[PDB]
Amino acid sequence: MDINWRHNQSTFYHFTSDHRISGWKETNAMYVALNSQ
Amino acid sequence: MKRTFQPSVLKRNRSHGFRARMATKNGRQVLARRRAKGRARLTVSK
Amino acid sequence: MIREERLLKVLRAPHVSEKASTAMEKSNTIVLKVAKDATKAEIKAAVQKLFEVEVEVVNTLVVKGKVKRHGQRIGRRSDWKKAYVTLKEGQNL
Amino acid sequence: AVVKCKPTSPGRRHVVKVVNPELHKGKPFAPLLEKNSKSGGRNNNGRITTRHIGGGHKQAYRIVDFKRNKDGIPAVVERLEYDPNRSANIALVLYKDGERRYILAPKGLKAGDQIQSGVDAAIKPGNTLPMRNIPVGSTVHNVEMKPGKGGQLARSAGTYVQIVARDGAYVTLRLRSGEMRKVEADCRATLGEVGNAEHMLRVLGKAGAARWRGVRPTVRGTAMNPVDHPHGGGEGRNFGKHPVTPWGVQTKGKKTRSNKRTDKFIVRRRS
RNA sequence: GCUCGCCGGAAGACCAAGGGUUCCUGUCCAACGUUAAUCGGGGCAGGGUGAGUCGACCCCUAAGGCGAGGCCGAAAGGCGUAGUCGAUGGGAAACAGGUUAAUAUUCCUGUACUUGGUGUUACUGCGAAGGGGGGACGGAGAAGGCUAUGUUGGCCGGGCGACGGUUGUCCCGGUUUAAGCGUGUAGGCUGGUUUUCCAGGCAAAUCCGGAAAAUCAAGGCUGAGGCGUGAUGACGAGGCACUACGGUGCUGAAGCAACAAAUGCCCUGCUUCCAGGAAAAGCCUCUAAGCAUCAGGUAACAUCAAAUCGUACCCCAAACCGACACAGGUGGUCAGGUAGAGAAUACCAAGGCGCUUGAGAGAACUCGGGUGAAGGAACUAGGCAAAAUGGUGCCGUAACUUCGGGAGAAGGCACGCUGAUAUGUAGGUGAGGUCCCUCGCGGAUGGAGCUGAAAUCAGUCGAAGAUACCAGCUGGCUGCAACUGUUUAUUAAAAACACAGCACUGUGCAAACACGAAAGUGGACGUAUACGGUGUGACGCCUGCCCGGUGCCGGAAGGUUAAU
RNA sequence: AGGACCGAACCGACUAAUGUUGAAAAAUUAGCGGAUGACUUGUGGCUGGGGGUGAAAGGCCAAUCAAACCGGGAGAUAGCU
């Protein structure tokens, strides 16, 4: 359980996805930034 | 959805197996580092 | 011919179970654990010459070892080989 | 015979076929066939060296006799056949000693027709003979460039070469290019012109026809990004550059012959 | 255990890949199981995988890998000849029934087949990393002959029935049988046989190829299925005797015919079309060197051998890939009934499941749905969403057009059930009988029986007959793109990319060009009617002027101009 | 006959709604496009990082791409926090 918890905390450490906050969290930040311009 | 690891034993061995690490200079250096690090399984054979 | 020094090392134990038992009491076959590298000619010759009976035919399977564990330490047992030795009409053991 | 297809279903609207009722409907002659594996445009390094190649139909190679070595033995043309490896058709011929061979089919040549290779051959279309024995001003195909080597000039369909001069040990040849070239006069050549001229009149009609001759699509350079082709980029259509190959060498004019070894043999370049 | 619901071209069954004991039995409930658990793919122990014929190994090869020498390269190393590996392909042979808690084309019963070794006997020219054949192989389409399978009748066994009727044009069930061996059919292909001669198959050849004759008109090859045997056997609905009520033994009737019919088989066929459709071995043949009263070949018989590894279990999934017992992904094989064109869809059979939290209540609100007065786009960025349309036959159908289309334009009418025509027709199939015989798996006649649309007329029911499920909304003007396609895996499917077609330009073959310190390889076993690059992008009418700038091509006089 | 027409398997992904600490690190449901072809799919092989491949989007190259991943130079450098 401890090994699975360390690896499953280590899941989104090297991500790329920009529309999702922290790799996973859905948001509207594309529209927020885009409307700020 | 179709994930990346679609397993096949024959491609596992032809690709990353022992006779294929020993077949060249750099794979032999791979085996040398795995033995020197001291590793329970060197290649992926079975 | 097969040398007798080879031919003694092949048979290892009689196999006791209920499939073995019904094979003896129903179809003349004695079931026995053999050497892992033992061929059917060696098992046939070794039952011909070590229990002095007449063997009709041998059928050999290989049984795979079970991954047990002690505490939190695993381990596979060990593969063995099992020979179904079909005798002729005149036999005892 | 060229035939416009009737325009049922687009795709057939613009097709022109070149049908030939005198070609053999059936299997080719087997012991002159061999395996011809398709490459994909890719060398022994795996890399695409010639682009736009790949796919298409499976083809078997046909050993065509370009040398024409059986001298003095006559041969009757057994039949004409479709060859997938060429523009022209091939004639299967039967020599008098019982040996069949495929030759390139010249223009007039039908089934049941005598051809004959060698020095003392009659001058009539289909006979391969050395060019010191052919008259000046004769159409001639399947020309050798070195004696004994095999034919390499005028092999593609509807193509001939005219012999214009015999100055010494050399014959001046008007190649189909328009180029005047000197060839050694001991080089064999086959009389007549090679015979499927109407090949150039076909029109293919759709995209998949090109695809089934093994010609993958051609992405044009200006549609790419600047990292890909020198033409690249630009906010809608934007050319602005002198037109080049994908490797920067000028297309549209720039001469790319450098031989210096065979410049002796070129009397006049093409125009 | 009885009911109820769900899947049933799957949510059933069998595998491959992958996993690796999860399989089966006994036992335990700590943790694992999104709850409880006596249960479990969990814990512990024991058991379980049986092969000459299935698969692998093996023989042969494709793509491709590696590669003695070799060519090349500062070194490492690249390429590659001989060779050697490499299946996803080619190559010998087993089927039915029974059995275990758990394996079975493997065990048992019955009946078989294949390939090698050895021995005997009879005849005898055998012999290759060599020659020839063969293996040997496309897309589409069309029927014909069959079968699997199903339906109905006959037969056999059982029932006469909780509620009106049900001894009959009644109800329920069964009606199965293989490989192998023998026969040779519906098809399909090909003229056959004998003699002589030859510049071909590196040599030889009796084989192949070729050229002459002569004669006969048939022979040969291949082939589904049927039929006979296998099989007076097995299986069989059910009864009988004991019954650790789990079953265990014994016995066991009929076991036929008609019709329908595949996407399976004849068929690697046939017809056709361009886009012109693997290789090598096994296999059959020919001989060379050699061996020639020997060895070897062929045939019969006998005898021996056929090793090794896989075999459990899941396999559209709780066991594989997805961190999960995850609403996802995952190749092949089998494919019953009724309605239906159908592998759609509805309801079902075989079979398998009810999705590992439940009990209530019946607020707002959210989600998935049903219906809605009058109105009917007034909503809105925009008819988004929903509603509507929806089948088959027949009538009918405009502009425009590349003469194909548009077109299912548009718009209509008919549709159930019953009866008659006709105790079910037209059609399909086709027995007994009869006739002939080159006599049988034959052809001619004949129509019993079975199957069976579709139409008209008459009648009848309902508000409604394409009644459910399933199943086009239509028309008008216009921009872009000719069209089918492709693309931003994961906010962009588009007018963008592609395209056929056009043009310009390079390229004479050791081609230009590309990958490569090089060797080499692709271009291409191609040769200018070809190949590469660039732009434009079907088709129709067309494509005007400018060479001063930048580029390219050509010129060589003069100026300037490096190493030396 | 057909890069032909309608339409399942099969391939895809146009719209809407849900979901958005999901059942799911891209799906479900209802409609939707192709569906004999430039199709689709299984098994194997080949191409590799300024390199591949690209019907071209800077797309894709193991949930990573205007230059992959791993290890090293390496405690880079950071007048900045």
Short mmCIF file of N, CA, C and O (backbone and C1' of nucleotides) in Angstrom, two decimals, chain E residues 333-367:
data_model
loop_
_atom_site.label_atom_id
_atom_site.label_comp_id
_atom_site.label_asym_id
_atom_site.label_seq_id
_atom_site.Cartn_x
_atom_site.Cartn_y
_atom_site.Cartn_z
P U E 333 -13.22 -15.70 -38.87
"O5'" U E 333 -13.64 -17.03 -38.11
"C5'" U E 333 -13.09 -18.31 -38.49
"C4'" U E 333 -13.46 -19.36 -37.47
"C3'" U E 333 -14.93 -19.65 -37.29
"O3'" U E 333 -15.48 -20.48 -38.30
"C1'" U E 333 -13.94 -19.48 -35.19
P C E 334 -16.92 -20.16 -38.89
"O5'" C E 334 -17.94 -20.70 -37.78
"C5'" C E 334 -18.00 -22.11 -37.55
"C4'" C E 334 -19.00 -22.45 -36.48
"C3'" C E 334 -20.40 -21.92 -36.71
"O3'" C E 334 -21.19 -22.82 -37.49
"C1'" C E 334 -19.74 -21.56 -34.47
P A E 335 -22.06 -22.29 -38.70
"O5'" A E 335 -23.23 -21.47 -37.98
"C5'" A E 335 -24.19 -22.13 -37.15
"C4'" A E 335 -24.84 -21.08 -36.29
"C3'" A E 335 -25.73 -20.06 -37.01
"O3'" A E 335 -27.10 -20.45 -36.77
"C1'" A E 335 -24.16 -18.98 -35.57
P G E 336 -28.23 -20.21 -37.84
"O5'" G E 336 -29.42 -21.06 -37.22
"C5'" G E 336 -29.24 -22.42 -36.87
"C4'" G E 336 -30.40 -22.89 -36.02
"C3'" G E 336 -31.71 -22.13 -36.11
"O3'" G E 336 -32.52 -22.51 -37.21
"C1'" G E 336 -31.18 -22.40 -33.83
P G E 337 -33.51 -21.46 -37.86
"O5'" G E 337 -34.69 -21.34 -36.80
"C5'" G E 337 -35.57 -22.42 -36.57
"C4'" G E 337 -36.69 -21.99 -35.66
"C3'" G E 337 -37.59 -20.91 -36.22
"O3'" G E 337 -38.62 -21.41 -37.04
"C1'" G E 337 -36.96 -20.36 -34.00
P U E 338 -38.95 -20.64 -38.41
"O5'" U E 338 -39.99 -19.52 -37.99
"C5'" U E 338 -41.13 -19.86 -37.18
"C4'" U E 338 -41.70 -18.61 -36.55
"C3'" U E 338 -41.76 -17.40 -37.46
"O3'" U E 338 -42.89 -17.39 -38.31
"C1'" U E 338 -40.88 -16.76 -35.37
P A E 339 -42.74 -17.06 -39.84
"O5'" A E 339 -42.51 -15.49 -39.93
"C5'" A E 339 -43.62 -14.68 -39.66
"C4'" A E 339 -43.23 -13.26 -39.35
"C3'" A E 339 -42.38 -12.52 -40.37
"O3'" A E 339 -43.17 -11.99 -41.42
"C1'" A E 339 -41.61 -12.07 -38.20
P G E 340 -42.64 -11.99 -42.90
"O5'" G E 340 -41.32 -11.12 -42.80
"C5'" G E 340 -41.40 -9.70 -42.71
"C4'" G E 340 -40.03 -9.13 -42.47
"C3'" G E 340 -39.02 -9.35 -43.59
"O3'" G E 340 -39.24 -8.50 -44.71
"C1'" G E 340 -37.99 -9.79 -41.54
P A E 341 -39.31 -9.15 -46.16
"O5'" A E 341 -37.79 -9.39 -46.53
"C5'" A E 341 -37.42 -10.29 -47.56
"C4'" A E 341 -35.94 -10.16 -47.77
"C3'" A E 341 -35.10 -10.38 -46.50
"O3'" A E 341 -34.67 -11.74 -46.47
"C1'" A E 341 -34.43 -8.37 -47.62
P G E 342 -34.57 -12.54 -45.15
"O5'" G E 342 -33.28 -11.96 -44.44
"C5'" G E 342 -31.98 -12.18 -45.00
"C4'" G E 342 -30.99 -11.23 -44.37
"C3'" G E 342 -30.89 -11.28 -42.85
"O3'" G E 342 -29.96 -12.30 -42.51
"C1'" G E 342 -31.06 -9.03 -43.59
P A E 343 -29.97 -13.01 -41.05
"O5'" A E 343 -28.61 -12.52 -40.43
"C5'" A E 343 -28.34 -12.77 -39.08
"C4'" A E 343 -27.41 -11.76 -38.46
"C3'" A E 343 -27.60 -10.30 -38.84
"O3'" A E 343 -27.16 -9.46 -37.78
"C1'" A E 343 -25.39 -10.98 -39.34
P A E 344 -28.14 -8.95 -36.68
"O5'" A E 344 -28.72 -7.63 -37.27
"C5'" A E 344 -27.87 -6.61 -37.65
"C4'" A E 344 -28.70 -5.35 -37.74
"C3'" A E 344 -29.71 -5.09 -36.60
"O3'" A E 344 -29.11 -4.47 -35.47
"C1'" A E 344 -30.70 -4.78 -38.72
P U E 345 -29.58 -4.83 -34.02
"O5'" U E 345 -31.15 -4.64 -34.08
"C5'" U E 345 -31.78 -3.36 -33.99
"C4'" U E 345 -33.27 -3.53 -34.10
"C3'" U E 345 -33.90 -4.47 -33.09
"O3'" U E 345 -34.12 -3.86 -31.83
"C1'" U E 345 -34.69 -5.00 -35.23
P A E 346 -33.95 -4.70 -30.56
"O5'" A E 346 -35.34 -5.44 -30.32
"C5'" A E 346 -36.54 -4.65 -30.25
"C4'" A E 346 -37.75 -5.50 -30.34
"C3'" A E 346 -37.73 -6.76 -29.52
"O3'" A E 346 -38.06 -6.51 -28.16
"C1'" A E 346 -38.52 -7.28 -31.66
P C E 347 -37.36 -7.33 -27.05
"O5'" C E 347 -38.11 -8.67 -27.12
"C5'" C E 347 -39.46 -8.69 -26.80
"C4'" C E 347 -39.97 -10.08 -27.16
"C3'" C E 347 -39.33 -11.28 -26.50
"O3'" C E 347 -39.79 -11.58 -25.23
"C1'" C E 347 -39.50 -11.64 -28.80
P C E 348 -38.84 -12.31 -24.22
"O5'" C E 348 -38.98 -13.80 -24.68
"C5'" C E 348 -37.86 -14.62 -24.75
"C4'" C E 348 -38.15 -15.78 -25.63
"C3'" C E 348 -37.20 -16.93 -25.48
"O3'" C E 348 -37.51 -17.81 -24.42
"C1'" C E 348 -37.40 -16.40 -27.77
P A E 349 -36.30 -18.58 -23.67
"O5'" A E 349 -35.76 -19.62 -24.74
"C5'" A E 349 -36.56 -20.74 -25.10
"C4'" A E 349 -35.76 -21.69 -25.96
"C3'" A E 349 -34.47 -22.25 -25.40
"O3'" A E 349 -34.70 -23.29 -24.44
"C1'" A E 349 -34.19 -21.71 -27.68
P A E 350 -33.69 -23.48 -23.22
"O5'" A E 350 -32.31 -23.87 -23.93
"C5'" A E 350 -32.15 -25.17 -24.53
"C4'" A E 350 -30.79 -25.30 -25.14
"C3'" A E 350 -29.62 -24.99 -24.22
"O3'" A E 350 -29.29 -26.07 -23.37
"C1'" A E 350 -29.29 -23.85 -26.26
P G E 351 -29.35 -25.86 -21.79
"O5'" G E 351 -28.24 -24.76 -21.51
"C5'" G E 351 -26.84 -25.01 -21.81
"C4'" G E 351 -26.14 -23.70 -22.05
"C3'" G E 351 -26.07 -22.77 -20.87
"O3'" G E 351 -25.12 -23.13 -19.88
"C1'" G E 351 -26.63 -21.51 -22.76
P G E 352 -25.44 -22.80 -18.36
"O5'" G E 352 -25.17 -21.24 -18.26
"C5'" G E 352 -23.86 -20.73 -18.57
"C4'" G E 352 -23.91 -19.23 -18.73
"C3'" G E 352 -24.31 -18.46 -17.52
"O3'" G E 352 -23.26 -18.35 -16.57
"C1'" G E 352 -25.48 -17.62 -19.38
P C E 353 -23.60 -17.89 -15.10
"O5'" C E 353 -23.44 -16.30 -15.26
"C5'" C E 353 -24.17 -15.39 -14.43
"C4'" C E 353 -24.74 -14.24 -15.22
"C3'" C E 353 -25.54 -13.30 -14.34
"O3'" C E 353 -24.76 -12.39 -13.60
"C1'" C E 353 -26.82 -13.85 -16.22
P G E 354 -24.96 -12.27 -12.06
"O5'" G E 354 -26.10 -11.19 -11.90
"C5'" G E 354 -26.14 -9.97 -12.66
"C4'" G E 354 -27.50 -9.33 -12.45
"C3'" G E 354 -28.00 -9.21 -11.01
"O3'" G E 354 -27.49 -8.02 -10.39
"C1'" G E 354 -29.70 -10.09 -12.39
P C E 355 -26.54 -8.14 -9.08
"O5'" C E 355 -25.26 -7.38 -9.55
"C5'" C E 355 -24.19 -8.13 -10.16
"C4'" C E 355 -23.60 -7.31 -11.28
"C3'" C E 355 -23.13 -5.92 -10.93
"O3'" C E 355 -21.84 -6.06 -10.34
"C1'" C E 355 -24.21 -5.96 -13.08
P U E 356 -21.45 -5.31 -8.96
"O5'" U E 356 -21.82 -6.34 -7.84
"C5'" U E 356 -22.88 -6.10 -6.92
"C4'" U E 356 -22.33 -5.91 -5.51
"C3'" U E 356 -21.00 -5.19 -5.45
"O3'" U E 356 -21.09 -4.16 -4.52
"C1'" U E 356 -20.85 -7.18 -4.20
P U E 357 -21.26 -2.64 -5.04
"O5'" U E 357 -21.88 -2.02 -3.75
"C5'" U E 357 -23.26 -2.04 -3.81
"C4'" U E 357 -23.80 -2.57 -2.55
"C3'" U E 357 -25.30 -2.51 -2.45
"O3'" U E 357 -25.89 -3.58 -3.17
"C1'" U E 357 -24.30 -1.83 -0.42
P G E 358 -27.28 -3.34 -3.80
"O5'" G E 358 -28.24 -3.81 -2.64
"C5'" G E 358 -29.38 -3.01 -2.32
"C4'" G E 358 -29.76 -3.28 -0.90
"C3'" G E 358 -31.01 -2.58 -0.48
"O3'" G E 358 -32.16 -3.33 -0.85
"C1'" G E 358 -29.34 -2.25 1.14
P A E 359 -33.48 -2.62 -1.13
"O5'" A E 359 -34.00 -2.13 0.29
"C5'" A E 359 -34.51 -3.08 1.22
"C4'" A E 359 -34.94 -2.34 2.46
"C3'" A E 359 -36.01 -1.28 2.26
"O3'" A E 359 -37.29 -1.85 2.29
"C1'" A E 359 -34.30 -0.42 3.56
P G E 360 -38.41 -1.30 1.39
"O5'" G E 360 -38.31 0.25 1.59
"C5'" G E 360 -39.44 1.05 1.88
"C4'" G E 360 -39.11 2.05 2.97
"C3'" G E 360 -39.76 3.40 2.76
"O3'" G E 360 -41.11 3.42 3.24
"C1'" G E 360 -37.51 3.71 3.20
P A E 361 -42.25 3.80 2.19
"O5'" A E 361 -42.08 5.38 2.04
"C5'" A E 361 -42.27 6.19 3.17
"C4'" A E 361 -41.53 7.49 3.03
"C3'" A E 361 -42.06 8.44 1.97
"O3'" A E 361 -43.20 9.19 2.40
"C1'" A E 361 -39.76 8.30 1.79
P G E 362 -44.39 9.30 1.45
"O5'" G E 362 -43.76 10.07 0.26
"C5'" G E 362 -43.46 11.44 0.31
"C4'" G E 362 -42.81 11.85 -0.99
"C3'" G E 362 -43.76 11.95 -2.19
"O3'" G E 362 -43.33 12.95 -3.09
"C1'" G E 362 -42.04 10.40 -2.63
P A E 363 -43.54 14.48 -2.73
"O5'" A E 363 -42.10 14.92 -2.25
"C5'" A E 363 -41.24 15.67 -3.05
"C4'" A E 363 -41.12 17.06 -2.43
"C3'" A E 363 -40.23 18.00 -3.22
"O3'" A E 363 -40.89 18.64 -4.30
"C1'" A E 363 -39.59 18.06 -0.95
P A E 364 -40.21 18.58 -5.74
"O5'" A E 364 -39.48 19.99 -5.86
"C5'" A E 364 -39.97 21.19 -5.22
"C4'" A E 364 -38.84 22.13 -4.85
"C3'" A E 364 -37.79 22.34 -5.93
"O3'" A E 364 -38.11 23.35 -6.84
"C1'" A E 364 -36.73 21.88 -3.89
P C E 365 -37.96 23.07 -8.38
"O5'" C E 365 -36.41 22.75 -8.55
"C5'" C E 365 -35.42 23.76 -8.42
"C4'" C E 365 -34.06 23.15 -8.38
"C3'" C E 365 -33.70 22.22 -9.51
"O3'" C E 365 -33.25 22.90 -10.68
"C1'" C E 365 -33.20 21.12 -7.50
P U E 366 -33.47 22.16 -12.07
"O5'" U E 366 -32.31 21.12 -12.11
"C5'" U E 366 -30.96 21.51 -12.15
"C4'" U E 366 -30.11 20.27 -12.12
"C3'" U E 366 -30.39 19.22 -13.17
"O3'" U E 366 -29.96 19.53 -14.50
"C1'" U E 366 -30.29 18.12 -11.14
P C E 367 -30.88 19.01 -15.69
"O5'" C E 367 -30.40 17.50 -15.76
"C5'" C E 367 -29.01 17.16 -15.93
"C4'" C E 367 -28.90 15.67 -15.86
"C3'" C E 367 -29.74 14.86 -16.84
"O3'" C E 367 -29.09 14.74 -18.12
"C1'" C E 367 -30.14 14.02 -14.71
#
